[PDB]
Antibody, heavy 171, light 160 residues
């Protein structure tokens, strides 16, 4: 029944802004308190905003106050997070969650997450002086680096699969 | 801020072993405000236990929870290979809402043919398929990393 689908994630510069959305279905949206919770690159879970069922109450942690805004559209069964004054600490997977009971604040359903990456532009300060020829050369050199990192991951997982496959074949 | 501390940070166990994960809270809370979540690698977190001891829907009976005051625990009576995951405790007593850092449960000698050959074919299959969402998560992280690396170079080309 319960479905939560986040969107609006992507790259954003430090100081920029982004708006995340969560389309909810399979339950009566306006009867439930909703939250956003993020997972950092180090895999820590960090609560970032909560909004009460009717929208009257909103709560935030100190590190996010004055920068993020949580809201909901009752007519469209949608939850939003307006993110501003972005910092590197905000790079994370962002999840939309439902709270079952306001008297315990357990989060009984989670979406699939949408990814936000705060991308530093500091290299521009030297790159802006280069010729187009040399910038394209640098850009070209990134593709085989990425392909090599991806192939190494595929090989690592092949190594993990093979003993399981051999165990199955011995049956 | 209520600080939430989990032990161990990481552990490796074998199917059949009892697992206990502890959660320590920096001030006393009611048992109604302590919850547990599991996260399979490559997937989002899912509610496991609420109000200290109540199993969420679909959670099998090998899981249990207890505690009071500042000391709480999660127990898996007999580990199954599908329980490989990270587990998190959370307090819902006051703002800011806070989670423990997580406890990662790994398989002891999980890639050893000698251990694996005694498993059921059903369990070997489940384990095989659990690897693909992990790989895909790692690959997507690399793609995002390189998207960020491209950006300032593209901006510089565009600025001419």
């Amino acid at each position: 029944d319960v479905k939560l689908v986040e969107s609006g994630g992507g790259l954003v510069k430090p100081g920029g802004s982004l708006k995340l959305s969560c389309a909810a279905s399979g339950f009566t949206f306006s009867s439930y308190t909703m939250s956003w919770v993020r997972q950092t690159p180090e895999k820590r879970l960090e609560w970032v905003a909560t909004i009460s069922s009717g929208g009257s109450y909103t709560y935030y942690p100190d590190s996010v106050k004055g920068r993020f805004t949580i809201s909901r559209d009752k007519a469209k069964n949608t939850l939003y997070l307006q993110m501003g004054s972005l910092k590197s600490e905000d790079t994370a997977m962002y999840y939309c969650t439902r709270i079952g009971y306001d008297e315990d604040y357990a989060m009984d359903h989670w979406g699939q997450g949408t990814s936000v990456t705060v991308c530093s532009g500091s290299d521009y300060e030297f790159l802006k002086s280069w010729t187009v020829e040399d910038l394209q050369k640098r850009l070209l050199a990134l593709d085989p680096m990425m392909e090599q990192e991806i192939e190494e991951i595929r090989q690592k997982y092949q190594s993990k699969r093979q003993p399981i496959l051999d165990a199955i074949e011995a049956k | 801020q209520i600080v939430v501390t989990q032990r161990p940070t990481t552990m490796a166990a074998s199917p059949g072993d009892k697992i206990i994960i502890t959660c320590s809270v920096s001030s006393i809370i009611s048992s109604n405000y302590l919850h547990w979540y599991s996260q399979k690698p490559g997937f989002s977190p899912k509610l496991l236990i609420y109000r200290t001891s109540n199993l969420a829907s679909g959670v099998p009976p090998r899981f249990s929870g207890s505690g009071s005051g500042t000391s709480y625990s999660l127990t898996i009576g007999t580990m199954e290979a599908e329980d490989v995951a990270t587990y998190y405790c959370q307090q819902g007593s006051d703002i800011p809402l806070t989670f423990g850092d997580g406890t990662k449960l790994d398989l002891k000698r999980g890639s050893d043919y000698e251990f694996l050959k005694s498993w059921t074919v059903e369990d070997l299959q489940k384990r095989l398929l659990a690897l693909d969402p992990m790989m895909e998560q790692e690959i997507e992280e690399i793609r995002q990393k390189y998207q960020c690396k491209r950006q300032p170079i593209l901006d510089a080309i565009e600025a001419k």
